[PDB]
Paper text:
[name] capsid has a pivotal role in regulating viral DNA synthesis and shielding viral DNA from cytosolic sensors. Previously reported X-ray structures of [name]-1(M) CA hexamers showed two distinct conformations with respect to a channel at the 6-fold symmetry axis. The beta hairpin structure (BHP) above the channel can assume ‘open’ (His12 forms a salt bridge with Asp51) or ‘closed positions’ (with a bridging water molecule between His12 and Asp51). Inside the channel, 6 positively charged arginines (R18) are hypothesized to mediate electrostatic nucleotide recruitment to fuel encapsidated DNA synthesis.
To examine its phenotypic effect, we reversed the deletion in [name]-1(M), restoring the arginine in mutant [name]-1(M) + [name]. The X-ray structure of this [name]-1(M) CA + [name] hexamer mutant at 3.29 Å revealed that adding the arginine reinstated the salt bridge. To test whether pandemic lineage-associated mutations influenced host responses, we reversed the adaptations in [name]-1(M) and infected MDM. We found that [name]-1(M) CA [name] + [name] could only replicate in MDM in the presence of IFNAR1-Ab, consistent with enhanced sensing and innate immune activation. Concordantly, VSV-G-pseudotyped [name]-1(M) CA [name] + [name] induced [name] and [name]-sensitive genes in MDM more strongly than WT [name]-1(M) (compare with Fig. 1e, f). [name]-sensitive gene induction by [name]-1(M) CA [name] + [name] was reduced by [name] depletion in MDM or [name] KO in THP-1. [name]-sensitive gene induction was suppressed by [name] depletion in MDM and THP-1. Importantly, combined [name] KO and [name] depletion in THP-1 suppressed all gene induction by [name]-1(M) CA [name]+ [name]. Finally, we found that [name]-1(M) CA [name] + [name] behaved like non-pandemic viruses [name]-1(O) and [name]-2, becoming more sensitive to human [name] restriction than WT [name]-1(M), as evidenced by rescue of infection by [name] depletion in U87 cells. Thus, an [name]-1(M) CA mutant bearing [name] + [name], representing non-pandemic [name] lineages, behaved like [name]-1(O) and [name]-2, activating innate immune gene expression in a [name]-, [name]- and TREX1-sensitive way.
Residue numbers in the entry:
A (entry chain B): 1 to 85, 96 to 118, 123 to 176, 189 to 220
B (entry chain A): 1 to 84, 96 to 119, 123 to 176, 189 to 220
C (entry chain F): 1 to 85, 96 to 118, 124 to 176, 189 to 220
D (entry chain E): 1 to 87, 96 to 118, 123 to 176, 189 to 220
E (entry chain C): 1 to 86, 96 to 118, 124 to 176, 189 to 220
F (entry chain D): 1 to 84, 96 to 118, 123 to 176, 189 to 220
């Protein structure tokens, strides 16, 4: 993070141990579930590229995904270098590889290199989540005795990682969902099959 | 949340990791019990629409309920658009088409877009709790050997999610409850059947 | 709680997550043991009526007791309305039902937070006395039960709600009577050790 | 505790949830082991009589010991009333204990009158009497076993002595022969090293 | 760490119990996995040589590795003594924290004796991790039924402690990886063998 | 610890509950392993003699070691009395016959907190050396024991209290002698892997 000290000068404060421990445990528990992305953006709130690299490097496993994340960052870094031919921050400076912590603080017209690099990380993380999703949306079909509440929970869970809701329901609930007709809210659909 | 910095300027402070972890665990534990609503309003105390979206996005499961919550927010947003620095529209209060600085601008006539959007969330969450309630208040009936204390605990628990208390009691306690007559407090009714 | 900000103005600070989590777990663990009342008064230190309602609403189960607590608060609110016919805080304003957070801070000088806390502790004591399983008359020392444990059970029941010597076993009762009048509890436990 | 606000005024700050939870769990775990007394004085650091009553009231069980503690507080309160006859008002014994005194009065007395440290002295005094009573074994019965290592026997010896020549007397004949050969003026380091 | 007090003087603040407890537990859990190095640099943020020795001394086991770390520090200290022949000038032993007081270390911090000594520790820790790695990169071969995702997870995990990825794959996936040809990203390679 | 308050006056701040709880649990877990000494110096950072006594008194068991620690403190206190606002004597530095304000007063600034901590760490080192089970001469590598583990046990014992090559098994010992003089521990462990 960044803080203005007593003398009014903007200095970098150290990332808290609670933040570091939280980000490590959520990846150990949730791996790459869709809810990991908002937690990262929340835990990395107001972070510098130096701090963002600290949180990513502390991740232990999933080195296949972390290698793919590096490739996506290099692709966005080359795009920044193309669109854009105190010094001007290049793509490698935003990622935090060829830029000091004071330079990153210096750029923060104010250049938010922390939010720009976080945009590249979240963009690369979304691609990993879509890949590591086990089931596709077409295979999510309600069982015979499965409650409609659970089937919709599985349906939109898959859809978050990646008409049709009524098509994959069982014939007992599908008969009820079609009778509701068009313009039925999800509240009315779950209440009808309860 | 919002904080006045050393320079006197209102800046957005990052939501604490304890708040984020607390809100995630309570939803994992309590799902959608009625006591989840007061915990959300407590943990999201003084939050901006940007912060409220962060806490909702970190929720992992229950994507069926979160989709219903989005629909309820869009309905309340359209009502705000009908009844009504730029003026905050319904999508600006929800946090979709408004920056974090704009949301801070309206809060610090002061427009409490955080409390307005929180009112819509609590309104939408109450509808989910009433749906996910398993038993109806008419089906809560005291067993033969069930203590009256436990039956009343189950009675008002269901009533919180959604004369009659005496009607559903067992004939042993019901004989005692009628003898008390009208104007009997709950203290006297539980004391009589102990 | 309440805090004075940098500008000197009294603003409401948000109740900490540790306080909220603590109050939830103690009610889950201890239910309504007598030691829950001092914990509530401790965790709700310097709280506003808005904060007191927040801690009570977070309680999950025990809705029978929470319904009785509401009735006791309404009774104390009506008594405040009778004794007492920026606006004047009525009984419903102190409880936090018909009063904003700024009004409650405004009255705080009227300590609407401590007054409403007095009604809650008053209503909670009535719940603890009801949920106490045993009566003080039934607490009797067993034949082989140590006197230390029997006194632990005796004053535990007495906290929820001469006689100590009467309910003791004939082995310890003979010793306790021999001490005579004016015997401290230290001397009574030391004699039957 | 007490804290000076931004405006320079002495206000009472609320006892932290960590302190309250710590004091509750240590009594649940350790009951009344001698190490509970220094933990109480540490957790109740800079506390007012109002705060000290809060920590004692949060104790769940051991109501027999808490009843004896109240009697010891009343005994020390009567002694304070005698040594200081009651004529900012002068704090009497009941004011120091926190029964007949408001939180502002207790802060007011803090010549500065440390009513918080005085009442804490009475509590620690009363708690020591409970620890000495609840001690199971007496120092005379702590005897080393045949195969018990001397390190463990000394651990049990001074543990009992904390709740309440002789160390050599109660040792087994194998270690006692070695301890007497060392003679007088032997440190505990040399006594434990000799029987290792 | 170092802090400027109210009087403007730079004083050493005590390392937090959370930081010390975190560093102890991560070494007990992870031993010397590659992700321990970024955690050390994160927990020891802005630390003095006195603080760095405190964190290293609190490590209980692994005294063989800690003895190797001391030798690597002595080697880097001798190199500093050579490049810099001897407020006094900080020699190699002063940077390590053996022959220098806490006030002298604060005094030099501008000479970043904390970051210099941390560079030697991370340098020595990398050598320990490379040694304690069990398998070599040449022995990481995909099993017959092992999913490609897991094999790549093991591949880059070993490579982090220490063409070839396609060579060690099973003939079923190797046939697919060669068909992709040159210039294939890791995203395309994992998607092809899913 | 010590803190300068808002008025600029140096007051004693209370030791945190995390510090007290940490020091109690580490002694319960690690007893008197060598790594307990750096943890104590870390947890007692910037502490007064009053604070140092608080951490030592909270230790429950190991009263034999705590009794030896008192004797070592008395020995260092007598040495201070021989070699030497009132002047701090040996008993004042230990915290027995000196108030908390006097200890703050002495902090020419006299660091009575660091002086007394030096005596405690000195006395604790003597306890660790005694409670060490095995001697360095008895640490011998087994037949199938990996050299990494044997060196882990070797320097672990040496921390509590040529020879590394002498006690190795003949398989690794043949390799260690072939390396000759001037071999680093990195080379010795790499050779026997």
């Amino acid at each position: 993070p960044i803080v203005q000290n007593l003398q009014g000068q903007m200095v970098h404060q150290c990332i808290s141990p609670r933040t570091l421990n939280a980000w490590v445990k959520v990846v150990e528990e949730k791996a790459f579930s869709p809810e990991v992305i908002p937690m990262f953006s929340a835990l990395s709130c107001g972070a510098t590229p130096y701090d963002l690299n600290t949180m990513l490097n502390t991740v232990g496993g999933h080195q296949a995904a972390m290698q793919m994340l590096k490739e996506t960052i290099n692709e966005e870094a080359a795009e920044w270098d193309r669109l854009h031919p105190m010094r001007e921050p290049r793509g490698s400076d935003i990622a935090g590889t060829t830029s000091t912590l004071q330079e990153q603080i210096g750029w923060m017209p104010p250049i938010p290199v922390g939010e720009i690099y976080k945009r590249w990380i979240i963009l690369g993380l979304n691609k990993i989540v879509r890949m590591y999703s086990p089931t596709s949306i077409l295979d999510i079909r309600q069982g015979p005795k499965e409650p409609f509440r659970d089937y919709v929970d599985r349906f939109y869970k898959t859809l978050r990682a990646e008409t049709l809701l009524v098509q994959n329901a069982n014939p007992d609930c599908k008969t009820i969902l079609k009778a509701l007709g068009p313009g039925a809210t999800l509240e009315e659909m779950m209440t009808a099959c309860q």
